[PDB]
Amino acid sequence: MAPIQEYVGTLIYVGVALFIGVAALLVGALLGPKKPGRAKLMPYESGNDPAGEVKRFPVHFYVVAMLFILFDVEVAFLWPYAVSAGGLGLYGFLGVLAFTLLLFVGFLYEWWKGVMR
Amino acid sequence: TWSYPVDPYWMVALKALLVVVGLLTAFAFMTLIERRLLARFQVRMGPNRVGPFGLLQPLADAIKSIFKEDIVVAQADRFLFVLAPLISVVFALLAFGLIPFGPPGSFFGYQPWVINLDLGILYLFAVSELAVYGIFLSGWASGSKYSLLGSLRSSASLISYELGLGLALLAPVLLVGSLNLNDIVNWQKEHGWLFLYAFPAFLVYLIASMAEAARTPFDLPEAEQELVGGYHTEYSSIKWALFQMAEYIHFITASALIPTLFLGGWTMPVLEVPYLWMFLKIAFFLFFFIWIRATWFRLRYDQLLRFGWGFLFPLALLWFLVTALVVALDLPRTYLLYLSALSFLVLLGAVLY
Amino acid sequence: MTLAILAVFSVALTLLGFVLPPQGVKRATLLGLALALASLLLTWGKPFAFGPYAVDGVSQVFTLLALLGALWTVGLVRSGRFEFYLLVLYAALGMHLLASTRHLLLMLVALEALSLPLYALATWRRGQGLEAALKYFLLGALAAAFFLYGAALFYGATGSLVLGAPGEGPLYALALGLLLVGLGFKAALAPFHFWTPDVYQGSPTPVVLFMATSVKAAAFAALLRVAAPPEALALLVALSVVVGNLAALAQKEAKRLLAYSSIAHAGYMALALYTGNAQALGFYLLTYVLATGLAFAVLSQISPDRVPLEALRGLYRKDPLLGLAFLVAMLSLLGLPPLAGFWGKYLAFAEAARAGAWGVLVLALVTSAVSAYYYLGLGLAVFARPEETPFRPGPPWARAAVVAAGVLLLALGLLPGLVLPALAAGG
Amino acid sequence: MTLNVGPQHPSTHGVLRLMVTLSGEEVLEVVPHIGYLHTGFEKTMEHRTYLQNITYTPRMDYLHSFAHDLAYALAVEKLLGAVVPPRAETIRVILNELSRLASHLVFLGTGLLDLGALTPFFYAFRERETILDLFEWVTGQRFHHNYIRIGGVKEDLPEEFVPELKKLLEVLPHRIDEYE
Amino acid sequence: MSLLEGLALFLLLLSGVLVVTLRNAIHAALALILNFLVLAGVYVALDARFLGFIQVIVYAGAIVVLFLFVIMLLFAAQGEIGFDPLVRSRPLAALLALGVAGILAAGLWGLDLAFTQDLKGGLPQALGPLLYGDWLFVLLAVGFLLMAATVVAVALVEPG
Amino acid sequence: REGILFTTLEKLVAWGRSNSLWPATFGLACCAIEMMASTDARNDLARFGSEVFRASPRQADVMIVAGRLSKKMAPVMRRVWEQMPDPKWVISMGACASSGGMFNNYAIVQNVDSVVPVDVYVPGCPPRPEALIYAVMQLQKKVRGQAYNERGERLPPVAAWKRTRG
Amino acid sequence: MSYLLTSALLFALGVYGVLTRRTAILVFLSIELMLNAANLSLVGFARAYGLDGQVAALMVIAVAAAEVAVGLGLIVAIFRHRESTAVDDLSELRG
């Protein structure tokens, strides 16, 4: 085990940080002049409309996102190995290499094919 | 924490409260000195009126920010729009205060870290991912499709480097064999400084901390002179300040971690006095980034992906495997020493023609 | 060792495919499979555990079949993009692993290894072929989810993730069922059949070949290791055999006809599962794979895109050999001695009666007589007038293949007493 | 897709509006739209004196003012057939190329600034200030010189302009190399 | 335990309700993030710490970002697009849904076990020997699965 | 509230606004580059307000209309102005802005002041950088409540909590 | 016992999800909740029968993650040239 106390201590901390956050925002929010909407409906640039209509966006963003998940799964697995690594011995290392090369093959496919397409 | 004391919940709260508001005040006077240090670099004088020495200007500035209209767009859905800065600041604040600063009891009889967990590194890595929520959501929240395009650019970049940060950080975790920061500090106290012993993992970590907006990505997008900046450009009042605030708290957090991990933040064979020496390492990195901040250009996003993804991760994973070999057979540590030293010679020689 | 060739090949080819033009990857992958088949043969009947991976008698029979099916499908394809060979390879590996494990977490991972490349192989981009893909995937992810949930409740009830742990009262009873859902769906035992008519129709023919033999084999492979209650089975079989044969009268398009049929066939195989014998079920699947394999090959040679009932007519005029091949195939699936198809049935039925389970066995037999309706609906249609419909002849390669297949069918029909000795449990 | 990179938003360093038809991320074509600053010189000068007109030519190119002026100066001078003494021709080149330095200096200042971070702007400007101050002495203004009239410059150089011009000629080589 | 415990499990269920109810996609997904956080807490609470941190890192940080990027790329201006002849299907959906809780409830009710066996907080220390031990094949299987996932995923989207 | 209750508070806030004036430039014509000048090096504006040149009009405040204002540009500008948060001032720099400059044409607009209301005029062409500092010094003392006309009467801090966006 | 009951409830909710939703992306979203219902169960029993159910869970997560990737990839690839993202209106396969 290890102290559950210190995980609690995180929760406390989160409660403090969130509080000071919200506190600042609520001061700011409540004070200020106002003139009701009738033209603050509009956003940046050229009056209304910031730039035309864009309807669709490239696959670029999908690809980048997708990479990150699969390789994040990699990292997840490589943490246990990082910790105990004199106990797992030489056989350990071979386990690691096998796994690594497999995800690296993944990599080489997406690299030789591209991250702008 | 199996060797370090726990503090009762109240005392935790007190430290937490101090460090949070500490980072507000931190951010305040940091903006001023950075502002001014840019000025000097560009052969000018920074703010220095608004008595006595420019040191009340952030007060004035801050007071200005409140007492302003709460612009809430028609075209924004309310809930996300108001929420969106909040999330980004919360998850940025969190996990500065993890980092140790001095040996036990040296805060009037209490611990200089707020928490200490039992898994340090994961917690850091985890909080770094949650910043990216804030970013793209804000984009969407405002509901301008221009803003949206900005935020995805931003997030895309972040998320790419974010993974690389992981494979960089494995290398010292090998050597100490534990996760918590403290173990890492104390290990270096004896054995000596992880920037010696795993130099290419130092490097990629540094250049990954660039990606926390440090300048030298910087087709972040920005808004000025470019395709619109993500998040901001639709925020106005206090909320806008919050976004910027977050970006700086990241900056100093990274500027602290690179000392904590890689240099031993309270390690020092000269004298260890608890807090003092930490602030001097902070100061150094602070200044390093501002020299960057001034003197170089930016990377055009296309270029930026090629650089992190394609180049940076192969140097990181090549190093992970090598060190993993060395650490696995539990050989003398000399063999990394030789390698670090050699890699430095490569990376030094590279600047020399 | 069979695993050894596949895994190695899979990785190696991944990168290789950049250097070679698309044909070289077809030549390569075709070869790979053939080597993997070789490696099986020379170690026949000798078992190798390594813990997780576990070579048994069973594995050997069912992956023999699976690789066969996979060779055929890679054969015919000509289309670009190195992946449309590559993926079939992958999927095969996935099935190899699937059969060769008992340990549930591996079994799940294996299920994904085979199911993933299948979803993508469902697209030559024909509009239907996206719909198909989609249905299969969404329904698939649900059955997946059950199989994962099942495993999690199993771990509760025994204290193991190996199959063959003891068992007890309600949770173990429940748990044992929820594993049947996932595995069940992949081989399509009604009611889980639903995707099998749409997906077979929508998907382009050669792909469907791979699916209709091999995936069914592999899925069944894993099903056998489950201890499936005699009660669960009685439900499954009945619904499969009923819905299969009855519903099939209604259809008039080749792919869908064979689809509903393959719900019925899943039902018939599932009889063997009562006692469970991979001598009986082994035999069955051999006759089923060959016959379906033959039959679906012919359907590719017509068009790679859905054909109505009429198109099959006149096959004898255009080519005599093919006309006979496809004929023999159709009778073999009806079950009609002295083609092997009867023997495949007979062995299964015998295991049902041996364990004693009568009502079910009767339904099965009755409705197999029903089956003759739509099967003659194809099988004779061959001799009638040709109409205007495509029929590109296809390679000399394949002509030889198809006729080989049809000879392997009728050969075991007269001579079943060759193979049965060595498809045994210990071999 | 259709991006409207606006008029003076966030900048362009003009007030140009561009209809950028984008396919994916590689720009097809940009259709420029101008008309956000036509303030009509051509019309107005049709209603002013020739002397007055020299105060209308440098309100066009801001940065390189003296070049417009000079170009006009010749055109009329030619027309009515005046000459222009030798010293004049000297003064006109010294200022003209000095103004060219003004234009390039501001150009490289903006260029680096534009994309690229902040710093090189300030250096490029600093040198420009020194040029403007030299100019200030002789024409009385930082820019929008009124120091050429039809036939030559309107008054002799002040005494102080030649020594100080020498000062800046020392520095510029070293500085130019440091921009490079 | 039931004092504090009650609240946290309540939150879990509540969060669950929201992600299948709410009629705007983003609000849904965002709720689901709150779900998986709570769940991460519940992992930590059950003497399984490492799994907790991986829950946040992978499931709430990786997976859901992928979800969100998809829901932005193509819009999702209503989370219930279609008023459709299947509008009848709402009460039948609620009916079967209840059924699946009932049957599962049966299987799980009256269960007797032990809760004594100490994982040791499930810290990565104690996970190392198993993971690269008896499960090492399974790991490599996982790894192959990922590689296949990459190859497939690319080939689906970009016609390669 | 609105910043104005206790004498004390409002004097605070008024200092707050006044010394923090972040300039948003609206470069336009020939003036503009001399307006950019006001930052670099020899002179300054980074020690009154700030160096920054706000990256949207949304998050800005003192709009410096610096240059010629073509008639076609007027409705755009009208809208750029409208979207500023509520305390907003317009310094109108240069003759060209202030009174249409010399051009009397159909094209140019005589006095930017028709459209957006001006608070400080700063005459000149280009008013040399030090003059621009002087303008902002004015506007500083304007917002403190210490601004007069020649007739002897004070003016309220803004002159644009007056006509606003309706 | 409380937690393990809760997991079954969370499963129930997920089913309600899959049947109700009328957007493709939100179907898939619901599936992901079900997969976590599972992973919780798996840990819950892991306290009883010790240690292997941890490793179990980790592998499970990974499978889920993999299945996310391909599935969302597909959902995108199907509807990247129309935007009526209802999960019906695939009626064209039926005979």
Ligand code: SF4
């Ligand atoms: S006032 Fe003078 S410097 Fe300014 S825009 Fe006009 S002509 Fe140019």
